[PDB]
Each structure stands twice: as C-alpha cells, then as structure tokens.
Design a protein around this nucleic acid. Sequence first.
RNA 1: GACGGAAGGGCACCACCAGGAGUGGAGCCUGCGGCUUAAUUUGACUCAACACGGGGAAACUCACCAGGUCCAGACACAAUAAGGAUUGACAGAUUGAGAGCUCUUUCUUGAUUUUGUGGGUGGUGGUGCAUGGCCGUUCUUAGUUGGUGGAGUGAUUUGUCUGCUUAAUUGCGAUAACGAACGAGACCUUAACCUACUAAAUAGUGGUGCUAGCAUUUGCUGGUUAUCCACUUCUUAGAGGGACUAUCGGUUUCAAGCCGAUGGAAGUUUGAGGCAAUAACAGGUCUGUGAUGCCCUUAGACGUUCUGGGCCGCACGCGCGCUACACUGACGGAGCCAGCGAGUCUAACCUUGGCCGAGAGGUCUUGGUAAUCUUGUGAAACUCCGUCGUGCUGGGGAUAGAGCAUUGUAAUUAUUGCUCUUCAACGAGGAAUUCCUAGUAAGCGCAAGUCAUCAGCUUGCGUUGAUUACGUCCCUGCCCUUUGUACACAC
Lengths: 53, 111, 73, 100, 92
Amino acid sequence: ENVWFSHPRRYGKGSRQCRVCSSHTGLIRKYGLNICRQCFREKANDIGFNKFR
Amino acid sequence: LISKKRKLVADGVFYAELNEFFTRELAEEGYSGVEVRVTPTKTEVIIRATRTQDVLGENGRRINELTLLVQKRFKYAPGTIVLYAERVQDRGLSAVAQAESMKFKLLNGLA
Amino acid sequence: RKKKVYTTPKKIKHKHKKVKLAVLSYYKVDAEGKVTKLRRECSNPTCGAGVFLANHKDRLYCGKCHSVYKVNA
Amino acid sequence: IKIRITLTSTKVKQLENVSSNIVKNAEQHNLVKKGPVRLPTKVLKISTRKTPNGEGSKTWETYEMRIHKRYIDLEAPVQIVKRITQITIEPGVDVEVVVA
Amino acid sequence: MLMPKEDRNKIHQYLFQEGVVVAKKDFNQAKHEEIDTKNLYVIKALQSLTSKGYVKTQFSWQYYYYTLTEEGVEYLREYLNLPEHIVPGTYI
RNA sequence: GACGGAAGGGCACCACCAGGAGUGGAGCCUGCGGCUUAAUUUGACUCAACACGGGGAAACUCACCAGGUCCAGACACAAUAAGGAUUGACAGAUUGAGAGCUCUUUCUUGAUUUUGUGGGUGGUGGUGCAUGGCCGUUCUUAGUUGGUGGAGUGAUUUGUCUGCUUAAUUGCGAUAACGAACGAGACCUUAACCUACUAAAUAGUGGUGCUAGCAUUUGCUGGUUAUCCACUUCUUAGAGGGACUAUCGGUUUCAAGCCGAUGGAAGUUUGAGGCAAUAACAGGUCUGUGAUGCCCUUAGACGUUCUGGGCCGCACGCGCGCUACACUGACGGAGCCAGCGAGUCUAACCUUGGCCGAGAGGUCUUGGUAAUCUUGUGAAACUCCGUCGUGCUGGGGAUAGAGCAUUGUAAUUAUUGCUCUUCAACGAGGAAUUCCUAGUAAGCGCAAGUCAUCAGCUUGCGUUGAUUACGUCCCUGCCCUUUGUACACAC
C-alpha cells in the first residue's frame, strides 16, 4: 500500500543517519561528514584527522 | 563548485570507504595500503599489496570490477578511474598485512 | 512482556486458501452458428474488450483505470 | 587566457615543492607574474568525547585539520597552459585552474 | 515472494549488462534510480540470487555491493540464450 | 605486596596556610532518587553517576504505553496445484484512517507460491557476573622489565642505592654490579622577538587629475579597479635565527644545583596541550553497527512501519548552573573595540538592499565555495551628560491574562521573538564544601556543537582585569625507604 511511509522524515534525526554504522543519535553533521562520533574516533587515524593538542 | 572544506572531507570519507572495502575483502589477497593520485579528469589509485598475482585475477577481471564499481557509482567514463597494483619489498613493513595474515591463521585454527 | 495475556479476542482470520470451486464464465451458447457475446464488457479505448465489468448492482466499474470510473451501463 | 591556478592541499611539503617548481618553471620560461599569494592556514576544530557511552570523567579531545591555500594568476598562451597542465604535475596537492 | 517478472528481468538484465549491482541499504523507499519498482524487491531478489549461489555480496557501510561469479554470468547467459562472446559484463 | 590512629625523606590550591570568586539559602531552566498511571523507556549511583549517554526529544531520534499490516521459512523437497494459486482491487457495517486483514460481489503481469521437513533473517531483548575496540580510573605521581654476573636450598633478591638538587631510577655520585629497554625527558602544535630574506588591485603606506567639505591661507577624511609606481611598518607561508639560566655576585665532598642586576622576549622546562611505561578494576559500554560465545520471537514475534501520546508527568531530597538580593547603582541619550568559527548544486545557508511598522513580521537579484561577502561582527560590561533615591521600591524579574508572525501541512501540557502587564521569593545565606599563581580567579560577552524550532549547557576565543601566596605536612591525597603484622578477593 501507498501509506506505508506516510509520516514525513524531512527534518530531525529521522533524516540524519551515520554513513558508517547507520547511527541516528550522536550524528555530528558538521562539514557534511555524516558519521557518528565513535566512528569518527576510529577512522580519524586512517582518514588523516590527527591529534596534536 | 562546492566548498573546499566539504570537498576534502568527502575526499577523506571516500578514502575511508575504499580502505574499509579493501581491508574487508582484498585482505585475504594480501592488501596493505592505498594512495589516491588526483589528476584532471583522472583518478589513479595505487595499491601496494602482497598477493598481487592472485588479487589480479585471470586477465584483469577483478581489477576491472573494482574499477567499474566506482566508475558506475560516480558516472565516470570508463578508464577515468584507474587502480594500479604493485608489490613492495620487505613485506614485513605492513602491519595491516600481518594483521590479516594471523587473522586468517586464527580462523584456520593455529595455536 | 513475559507476562502478557492479550485480552483482545483471538483473531485467527487466515484468508481463504482458494477453495476449489467449479468452472465459471459462461457468456452465451450459440450452437451451430455465429457465437455472440454476453456479460457486457468495457468499451474503454485502451482496453481490447478484456475487462470484466464490475456488475455488482446497477453499477459498473473498469479495471484498466485503477482509480476513477463512474458509469451506469 | 587570464586564468588562475590555486592549490588547496594539506600536504605542506608537497605544496611547498609544487609551488617552488612551478615558480622555477615560470621564471625560467620568462612569464611575468606576482609571487604565490598565501592564505591564512584554515584550522578545522571538531571536539568529541572520548567515551562512546556517557560514563567516565568529562574528558574531551579536539581533532584538528589544517588547510593551506595558495594561488597564482597566469596570462599564458593556450599551448603553454596545456603543457603546464599535462607536465610538472605533482601528486598530493589538489590544484585547480579557473578563468578570472 | 510476489514480485513482478518485468522488474525481475530488469534486475537480471542489469546484472548481465554490468556484472555488479549497487544497492544502498536504504529500503522502505521504493524509488530506485532508473527503475520504478520497489528497491526492497530489487534487493530481496538479488539476495535470493546470492543464496542460490551465483553472485557474491558485500555490505561496506550498508551499500549492498554485489559481484557476479564465474558460474553466475554463465547462468545468466544460458538463461538469456545469447551468442558466444557477445557481451559479457567483465569484458574489456 | 597490602595496610598501620609506625618512623624518616621527598611532593600536590582535584590539600592546607593569607585570601579572592563561590555554592549551600530565593526564583527559574537541567539530570538522579522517590511519588503516578497504561506507560512516565533505559545506562551509571564517592573521587572515577547525577547540563553525563555529545539525551538543547512535538507526531521517527522514541529504547516505553494504546491501537493498525505483511510476514521477506533467503535456499530445495512431501501434499491443493492453467477444468489456476499468491499478494493485490471501487462502496456502506468497522477503523482518525478514502490499509477488505472481514460482511451485499465483478478481475487486469502472474507458479516466486499455503503447512511441515532442514535451515535462515531482524532485533535500541538480555548477559560488560561472556568479548573485541573505545574510554575512565589506578596514575599527573614516576615507576617498570629483561641478559650476564653475585646472594639465598627456595619463593625471590642485587642491579632499580648511601647524601645533594630537580617536576621526575632527572642527574652528580657511591657502589656485586656491568650492560640494555620502556616511562620521564626528549618529541610535535599554539601564543610571545625580528622595522631583517623571498611574497600580498581579496588592504594600506607614501604622490597626482575626479575630488567635496571644513573652506578661500600652506592641513584631515574617504570612494574614482587595465586610472600611472617602491614596499609590507598594519591580514600572512617558509632552510627562518633566538633564552641554552646568556654575563656576574653568593651557598654546596664548592660536583650536580639553588637565590639575586639587566640590555635581550619571557631566565618557574618561556608558556599551554597531544601522545604517555608495566600490571590491574570484574569501573562504563551488548542503546555504534550484517560482531560474536549462551538463553529470547520465529509467525495474533521483541522483525520494518502508521495515528495519538510519554520521556516536560509532582507531595518531596539532592547536582554543574543563569538572574539576583541595588547606588561601583537601575534606567535614558550620545563615543568605539578584536578573536577562536560556520555558511547554498542538483539543494537553497549566512542573509548586504528599497520599502510598509511599537517591535517581532512581510518582496528579486545584486554577495559568497568563501584574506574578496555575510563580518571594522559598530558584542557586553565600558566613557560623558541625565531621572529615582533607601520604599522590597524605578531593585529582582515571574507567576497570571491580552495581543501581533517567519518553524513545523501538525504548539497544545505558554516551542519560539516583541508590546502591555504581573511586581511574587529574594535584604550576601547554618553546618558543610569547588577553582586559583598569571593576562591567570573572576565579571562581561562572541563563534561553533547538537539547528526545521528552541541554551540559562558544552567546545574555544576575545574585552575589563585584582590584593592575595614562593611555605607546610596540620587535615585530605602520591611515591620511596625502614619497620610491625595472626592480612593476602589483601583494613
């Protein structure tokens, strides 16, 4: 039926999902990287996000 | 066209995606590392790996599939994306390669 | 959870599993001659006379157009 | 024809040697220009809690990205800009050319 | 399942034409690019194809990459009744 | 090894000494306990839970409470089974429901197909008293371990320590030890000096025509972008150089070091951080995941979704917090300031403009992929002149009501922003406790994070900017040694 997904998801954390683990909560949207915080911690070493201070 | 900050962040996230894909499947093919060569209308991506002759596939079919995946994903004309495969001396200088080697050894059942 | 009685009545209402009935769709009988047509069909231009008209009660409805069809034939 | 070549990489040594060899090529091929205009290093700070959960002391870390930007304006012929695009190309530096 | 043969053959023909099928793990959307059929139907059909053993599956951040097999392309070819060396998906 | 209301020695504003700001007392936004129903979903409960799950939630995020479908047994077989399945279609009874899942009935692509036999998929159902990874903590202290040699039968011990300094098993040195490693230190980013080297129509310094004004008499402000020049003294990248206690005076087997005078940039490593040894907690975490060992749903499932709610419920106790309890004032009009930071391509952000207005509101592109634009962010306290003057009052802003519109197709248990109003506790707060040695305590703010909407929160930056301290082991903690022990999941 055509009313399976009637309710919108055009705002809120209904839209925003992580690009790695499909997280909805904790999604840091900044810079348009769309991954959750722990995924960012894990993948910073390999992407090139380096801790200096 | 779009902002440089978001542009290079997407560069990083695509690098992470490709590294995850490579370490997920090309691991048993002795995958060690990658580096992206950016050229006008060309994306060269290099791979120094241990099991090059078996990652290659019979007449480059697996390399063709790896290429044409991202080609069709980003509507590239065929040949614009190109990935090159080499073998580095001193294979012990690859922590990821050693990691996957003993990772497979565990599922094999060695002590 | 592990303590739930579901006081709403049992609703075992599994649909009919296609009870084997007899044969159907008799239009008309024209023995030894030209065969005529009965069970008035749809005249819609996109149809080729294949739509079983919804002859429920003094009212018809088409099948090709899934949404709107108001006729009285 | 009145083009601008800019470099927006994060590899500082590759950017430095790219700028150096491009400057050397332009000077040795006698094309008048002004020096590579250098932009302030743009720092991206992203602060994240260490703990995946909500426990532990309220500790923090700040992941930082650095961006160096350079640009040079060239008024140079079509064949020579084709030559510059096709040669003296050094990887690791995201270099793009626009017009005006 | 009850899923049209029209888009079943559409998915099969894309499988043959490319050799790999990309499917984001974004179901309940029913709007795939270039196809008006349900993307959940597409993904279920491809996953059934994998289970019967002609194409290999990868997730890779919930993106459902698929890749044809030495016997998978042969099976599709023999179903389609195509001449020898006509148009394999891994040609070059 | 642990511990001692045992000794010695060396340290710490998550300790004190003299203090400053405080909180605890008032109001009000936040989280926990308790109370409540159908629920008010759970994690954690000294430091090391309690503006913490980046948890500032309206209808997903939603893990909970009412109702509503398909079952996706992916993959093959036994039985109806083209004299045709299986989902799917228009109406009143039903349901907010224009979802036949059923009641009066008429079918378009159609062998994937119904039970079981085997097996699978999903899970924010558990188990951290199963894990990995990430943390936090032990531990912001300096400790840790081999090889060889010596000692003891052995567990083990020396190495790794008398005395001096440091923040430091930092070193000097003594010496059954010699030779090594990690931690520390080194290491890297940030801020502070260069009027010097290469570079700035994304700005000026200095000269002219357009210049206008003060004005007539010899000076200041800016615009005029293929309108003519040298440079960066103000926005910046780099072998950059430089504080290594540099020179000198005092104390020390005058060795390592410590206290003083200064051009020089600082002479507590010149500061502030990241990373951080060995071992451990049964400390957090299955709520970050198509990650798992072991139990749970396998079809009126806990599998994906729809409409309402709920996490905001309040008799009560607590925890960072913002405004306060007025004259250094409150309010009113005039003069000006920078920085960390973000910002729209197959979508529409930051918003520069004319205008209709007490304010909040309402238009098309000119600006921007961003040293050019938003943004001299003209911010706040702050400087000058003004009203009130000690009345819970012009202080304090909250509890009520009336209105105006961008948000969300949806505000309502005020979402929000303005105008009127209201004028409530609060007159610096008991026992008791948090931060602090320089641009720092604190006071003001600004940018980002979560942002459709909403900061009183957090991550950083900037403005104004203090007396206090240069000691201690007295309370609370850390390490080492000696020592006692009937402890050894270890007081």
